[PDB]
Design an enzyme around this catalytic site. Sequence first.
Site, PDB file in Angstrom:
ATOM      1  N   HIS A   1       0.396  15.336   2.145  1.00  0.00           N
ATOM      2  CA  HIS A   1       0.085  14.678   0.868  1.00  0.00           C
ATOM      3  C   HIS A   1      -1.037  15.453   0.218  1.00  0.00           C
ATOM      4  O   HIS A   1      -1.506  16.450   0.747  1.00  0.00           O
ATOM      5  CB  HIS A   1      -0.160  13.160   0.970  1.00  0.00           C
ATOM      6  CG  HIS A   1      -1.391  12.705   1.687  1.00  0.00           C
ATOM      7  ND1 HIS A   1      -1.441  12.576   3.067  1.00  0.00           N
ATOM      8  CD2 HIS A   1      -2.573  12.282   1.213  1.00  0.00           C
ATOM      9  CE1 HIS A   1      -2.633  12.081   3.384  1.00  0.00           C
ATOM     10  NE2 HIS A   1      -3.338  11.898   2.283  1.00  0.00           N
TER      11      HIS A   1
ATOM     12  N   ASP B   1      -7.962  16.220   3.120  1.00  0.00           N
ATOM     13  CA  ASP B   1      -7.693  16.348   4.552  1.00  0.00           C
ATOM     14  C   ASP B   1      -6.328  16.978   4.844  1.00  0.00           C
ATOM     15  O   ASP B   1      -6.038  17.251   6.013  1.00  0.00           O
ATOM     16  CB  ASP B   1      -7.900  15.043   5.309  1.00  0.00           C
ATOM     17  CG  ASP B   1      -7.046  13.877   4.847  1.00  0.00           C
ATOM     18  OD1 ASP B   1      -6.832  13.737   3.631  1.00  0.00           O
ATOM     19  OD2 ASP B   1      -6.631  13.077   5.713  1.00  0.00           O
TER      20      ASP B   1
ATOM     21  N   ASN C   1      -8.406   4.700   4.176  1.00  0.00           N
ATOM     22  CA  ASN C   1      -8.782   4.883   2.781  1.00  0.00           C
ATOM     23  C   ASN C   1      -7.569   4.568   1.926  1.00  0.00           C
ATOM     24  O   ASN C   1      -6.592   5.329   1.926  1.00  0.00           O
ATOM     25  CB  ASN C   1      -9.313   6.288   2.556  1.00  0.00           C
ATOM     26  CG  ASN C   1     -10.018   6.408   1.284  1.00  0.00           C
ATOM     27  OD1 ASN C   1      -9.663   5.699   0.294  1.00  0.00           O
ATOM     28  ND2 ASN C   1     -11.086   7.240   1.243  1.00  0.00           N
TER      29      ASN C   1
ATOM     30  N   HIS D   1      -4.299  14.846  -0.604  1.00  0.00           N
ATOM     31  CA  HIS D   1      -5.726  14.658  -0.355  1.00  0.00           C
ATOM     32  C   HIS D   1      -6.336  15.853   0.382  1.00  0.00           C
ATOM     33  O   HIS D   1      -5.622  16.678   1.012  1.00  0.00           O
ATOM     34  CB  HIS D   1      -5.957  13.371   0.429  1.00  0.00           C
ATOM     35  CG  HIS D   1      -5.680  12.133  -0.350  1.00  0.00           C
ATOM     36  ND1 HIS D   1      -5.505  10.916   0.265  1.00  0.00           N
ATOM     37  CD2 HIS D   1      -5.643  11.887  -1.672  1.00  0.00           C
ATOM     38  CE1 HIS D   1      -5.345   9.976  -0.644  1.00  0.00           C
ATOM     39  NE2 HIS D   1      -5.424  10.544  -1.827  1.00  0.00           N
TER      40      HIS D   1
HETATM   41  C1  LIG Z   1      -9.866  12.735   2.107  1.00  0.00           C
HETATM   42  C2  LIG Z   1      -9.367  11.297   2.318  1.00  0.00           C
HETATM   43  C3  LIG Z   1     -10.285  10.426   3.241  1.00  0.00           C
HETATM   44  C4  LIG Z   1     -11.674  10.464   3.212  1.00  0.00           C
HETATM   45  C5  LIG Z   1     -12.451   9.664   4.073  1.00  0.00           C
HETATM   46  C6  LIG Z   1     -11.899   8.849   5.016  1.00  0.00           C
HETATM   47  C7  LIG Z   1     -10.472   8.771   5.078  1.00  0.00           C
HETATM   48  C8  LIG Z   1      -9.565   7.987   5.848  1.00  0.00           C
HETATM   49  C9  LIG Z   1      -9.900   7.056   6.879  1.00  0.00           C
HETATM   50  C10 LIG Z   1      -9.197   7.032   8.111  1.00  0.00           C
HETATM   51  N1  LIG Z   1      -9.550   6.149   9.062  1.00  0.00           N
HETATM   52  C11 LIG Z   1     -10.534   5.284   8.902  1.00  0.00           C
HETATM   53  C12 LIG Z   1     -11.209   5.227   7.726  1.00  0.00           C
HETATM   54  O1  LIG Z   1     -12.243   4.300   7.601  1.00  0.00           O
HETATM   55  C13 LIG Z   1     -10.918   6.142   6.678  1.00  0.00           C
HETATM   56  C14 LIG Z   1      -8.306   8.431   5.392  1.00  0.00           C
HETATM   57  C15 LIG Z   1      -6.971   7.921   5.779  1.00  0.00           C
HETATM   58  O2  LIG Z   1      -6.903   6.686   6.050  1.00  0.00           O
HETATM   59  O3  LIG Z   1      -5.935   8.642   5.606  1.00  0.00           O
HETATM   60  N2  LIG Z   1      -8.405   9.349   4.438  1.00  0.00           N
HETATM   61  C16 LIG Z   1      -9.708   9.577   4.188  1.00  0.00           C
HETATM   62  N3  LIG Z   1      -9.223  10.585   1.042  1.00  0.00           N
HETATM   63  C17 LIG Z   1     -10.225  10.463  -0.002  1.00  0.00           C
HETATM   64  C18 LIG Z   1      -9.550   9.629  -1.064  1.00  0.00           C
HETATM   65  C19 LIG Z   1      -9.022  10.327  -2.302  1.00  0.00           C
HETATM   66  C20 LIG Z   1      -9.717   9.260  -3.133  1.00  0.00           C
HETATM   67  C21 LIG Z   1     -10.548   9.736  -4.294  1.00  0.00           C
HETATM   68  N4  LIG Z   1     -10.877   8.587  -5.175  1.00  0.00           N
HETATM   69  C22 LIG Z   1     -10.452   8.723  -1.900  1.00  0.00           C
HETATM   70  O4  LIG Z   1      -8.511   8.974  -0.324  1.00  0.00           O
HETATM   71  C23 LIG Z   1      -8.311   9.533   0.923  1.00  0.00           C
HETATM   72  O5  LIG Z   1      -7.483   9.160   1.680  1.00  0.00           O
HETATM   73 ZN   LIG Z   2      -5.898  10.785   5.720  1.00  0.00          ZN
HETATM   74 ZN   LIG Z   3      -5.025  10.636   2.236  1.00  0.00          ZN
END
Ligand SMILES: C[C@@H](c1cccc2c(-c3cncc(O)c3)c(C(=O)O)[nH]c12)N1C[C@]2(C[C@@H](CN)C2)OC1=O
Ligand SMILES: [Zn+2]
Ligand SMILES: [Zn+2]
Length: 232
Positions: A85, A89, A181, A87
């Site tokens: 996807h 990560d 997230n 994002h």
């Molecule tokens: C890079 C990624 C990201 C950042 C920090 C944490 C996570 C987690 C996560 C996993 N496990 C437990 C938890 O607490 C958090 C995941 C996950 O769930 O895939 N992904 C994370 N981004 C950032 C963003 C874009 C948006 C911009 N407005 C915010 O939405 C995301 O999914």
């Molecule tokens: Zn993720």
């Molecule tokens: Zn993501």
Amino acid sequence: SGEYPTVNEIPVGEVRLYQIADGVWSHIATQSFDGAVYPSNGLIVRDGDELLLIDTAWGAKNTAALLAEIEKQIGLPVTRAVSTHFHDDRVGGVDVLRAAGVATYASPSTRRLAEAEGNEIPTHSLEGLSSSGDAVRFGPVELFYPGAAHSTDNLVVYVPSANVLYGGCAVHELSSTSAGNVADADLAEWPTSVERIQKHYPEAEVVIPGHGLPGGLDLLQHTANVVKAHKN
Ligand SMILES: C[C@@H](c1cccc2c(-c3cncc(O)c3)c(C(=O)O)[nH]c12)N1C[C@]2(C[C@@H](CN)C2)OC1=O
Ligand SMILES: [Zn+2]
Ligand SMILES: [Zn+2]
């Protein structure tokens, strides 16, 4: 020393590999986001005398470290990468890959979203994935679009030789208490998308989440449960 590596065990900037099956590894890295540190997974699949990479290691320096770790531990060249996807990560590090000779791929939906939001952009579009339930072959894997879940563009990856299901961020680890997230998620469609995965891959033996520990098929039901409860 053999256990699946965890967030406090990986300094930001280092990468570890974990052997999942013959010719299948996960990669694990850590990154800071909004003042908290998180682990994240990707996949490596042996493709004859080359390697297919699934997802970056969440950043340029992490992804350079990933390439170095692969050279150390495996010693075969990464020739192609797929991002599951848009994002950071999943695509942060695509520019590093592209300058290291790796051909980078993602769905057109992922490419559009990455571009719009200012994330790194895979070079090549993966057609044939735009409707839920679609699947295409890509080297030693099948790519599957289950529908909107963690994001509208999320793909999952199946390794048929090993019955390994890489769910990416559409799938949570068993210890998860939250839907992660959810900024870009569709909580209403997510259970339906997970049901499609469950129906399409009933013989999966290992299920790997986008963040956290692999397990078995129960990760799929657990994910549906936590998402429904988050929404509720
Ligand atoms: C890079 C990624 C990201 C950042 C920090 C944490 C996570 C987690 C996560 C996993 N496990 C437990 C938890 O607490 C958090 C995941 C996950 O769930 O895939 N992904 C994370 N981004 C950032 C963003 C874009 C948006 C911009 N407005 C915010 O939405 C995301 O999914
Ligand atoms: Zn993720
Ligand atoms: Zn993501």
